[PDB]
Amino acid sequence: SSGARVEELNKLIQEFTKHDQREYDDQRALEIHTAKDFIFSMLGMVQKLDQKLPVANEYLLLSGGVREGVVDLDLDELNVYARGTDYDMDFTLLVPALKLHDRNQPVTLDMRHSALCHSWLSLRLFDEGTISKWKDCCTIVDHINGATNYFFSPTKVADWFYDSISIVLSEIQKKPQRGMPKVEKVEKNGTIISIILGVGSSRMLYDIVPVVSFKGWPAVAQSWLMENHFWDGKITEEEVISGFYLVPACSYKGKKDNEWRLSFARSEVQLKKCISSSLMQAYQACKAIIIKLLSRPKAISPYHLRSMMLWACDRLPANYLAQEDYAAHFLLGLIDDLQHCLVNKMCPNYFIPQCNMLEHLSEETVMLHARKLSSVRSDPAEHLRTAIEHVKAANRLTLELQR
C-alpha cells in the first residue's frame, strides 16, 4: 500500500529532523555569542583602520554558511568545509559596505550590461568624499567625451575587505592571547572571506560577505508587490519589503569585476516565520539528499531548492501545507519540482520570476543531474536513510571534540 510508503518517509523525515535541528546548551550558547562578539568587534576595528565602512552599520547574521545555500551566491569554485571536521556551527554575515536609499536606485543601478537579477553600481553621482573614499575599489572608466564613471567593483572590494581583516587580525596575534578566540583559518574564497574561530569546546565558521545595502524594494521586482502571497496577513508587509541587497556575484555572462547580484536575504528571514514546519522539514531533508550527488560539475545550489520551496508556498493553499502528516508528500513534491526545473533548464527566481537561475547550466550537465535524480525519485527513503547517517556522523564528530 502506498500509504505504508508515505508513513516510512514521514518516519525518516521526522528522524532526520531530530538530528538536523540544532539545540545548544548554556555552554555552547555562550561559546557562539563570544565568537560573534569577536567578529563584530573585528569589523569595528576594520572600520577604524580605513574610514571606508559606514560608522552606523547594520549586519545580517544567518544561521547557515554560504555553502549551505542561504544566500544567492555562486557556490562553484568554493572550497568545501565539512561539518564536524572543520567547523561545528556555521554562519554567514552580510556586511554592508554602502548604504543607499530608494531614491538612489534609477541613478546608481546601471543594468545596461547586466542580465536579470544583476546590475552594476555607479558611484558617479555621489559626493566627492565618497568617490575619493572608494576610488581604489572601483573600476574607473574614462571617456573621450562625457563624465568619467566609477563602477563599484565586487572584486576590488573583496580584496580590500580581506586585506583589512588580515591586518586587524594580525595585530591581535602580536598581543598576548588571553580571552581571544583562536582563529583557526582565514581565507579569501572568491568574494567571500571565511573565518573559523575556536571558542572553548566548539568551532565557529563565519562566511563574511561584503554587501551593498539598499533601502526599499527593487524596481525590477515591482510585480512581486502586485499579488497576494502566502505571508499576506501573517506578517506585516513593511518588514518584508523594506530593503534589499547587492551580493558580490555575477551572472555567467556579466563582468566579474563590475557585476553584483540582487539578494533578498532579509525578505526570506521574515518569510521563514510564515513557512510551515512540515514543508521546512521536507526542505531540509531534500537538501541533504540532492546537494551531495548534484554538485559536480555545475552544482544546483540549495538556494535553487529554497526558491522552489518558496514557490510552493504561494501555488499551494495553507490547508495542505498545514497538516504535519503530509511531510512525505512535501518531500516528493520538491523532488518533482527539482525534476521539472532540470528538464526544462528553468528555475525562476521567487522575487524576480523572469530570471532563470539555471541559464548558466549546459545541456549536458543538466541532463546528467536529471538521470541522477530519477534514481533518487525511485527510492527516496533510501537516499534519506543515508543522509541521516551523514548527519549522525557529523553530530558525533562535533561531540567528540566537545567532549
DSSP letters, 126-155, are S-HHHHHHSGGGEEEE--SSSPPEEEE-HH
| Helix (H) / strand (E) containing 192 | strand 192-199
**Grid cell of 385 as nine digits:** 536513510
Angle at 155 between CA 146 and CA 306, to 5 degrees: 115
Q: Rounded to 5 degrees, what are φ and ψ at 332? A: -70, -35
Fold adopted by 2-402: Beta Polymerase; domain 2 (3.30.460)
CA–CA distance, 20 with 391 (Å, rounded to integer) = 7
- Those residues whose C-beta lies under 8 Å from the C-beta of residue 157, and which sit 6 or more positions away, are 97, 137, 191, 210, 248
Q: Rounded to 5 degrees, what are φ and ψ at 152? A: -60, 115
331: closest CA among 377, 263, 389, 395?
377
Q: What is the resolution of this structure in A?
A: 2.4
- Those residues whose C-beta lies under 8 Å from the C-beta of residue 177, and which sit 6 or more positions away, are none
- Amino acid, single-letter form, for residue 373: L
| Helix (H) / strand (E) containing 338 | helix 327-343
137: closest CA among 72, 77, 59, 210?
210
HSE-up (13 A, CA, CB side) for residue 76: 13
CA–CA distance, 195 with 46 (Å, rounded to integer) = 15
259: closest CA among 102, 95, 106, 116?
116
End-to-end CA distance of the chain: 45
122: closest CA among 144, 96, 145, 153?
153
230: closest CA among 286, 273, 266?
273
CB-CB contact of 214 with 97 (8 Å): no
41: closest CA among 160, 162, 180, 228?
180
Cα 232 off chain centre by:
24
- Those residues whose C-beta lies under 8 Å from the C-beta of residue 244, and which sit 6 or more positions away, are 214, 216, 217, 218, 221, 262, 263, 264, 266, 267
Method by which the model was determined = X-ray
CA–CA distance, 132 with 134 (Å, rounded to integer) = 6
HSE-up (13 A, CA, CB side) for residue 340: 10
Cα 221 off chain centre by:
19
CB-CB contact of 263 with 247 (8 Å): yes
**Grid cell of 146 as nine digits:** 562625457
Give the other-Cβ count within 10 Å of 175's Cβ.
8
CB-CB contact of 169 with 183 (8 Å): yes
CB-CB contact of 205 with 90 (8 Å): yes
Per the omega criterion (within 30 degrees of 0), is the bond before 297 cis? yes
- Amino acid, single-letter form, for residue 30: L
- Amino acid, single-letter form, for residue 168: V
CA–CA distance, 323 with 311 (Å, rounded to integer) = 18
Breaks (C-N over 2.5 A) in the chain follow: none
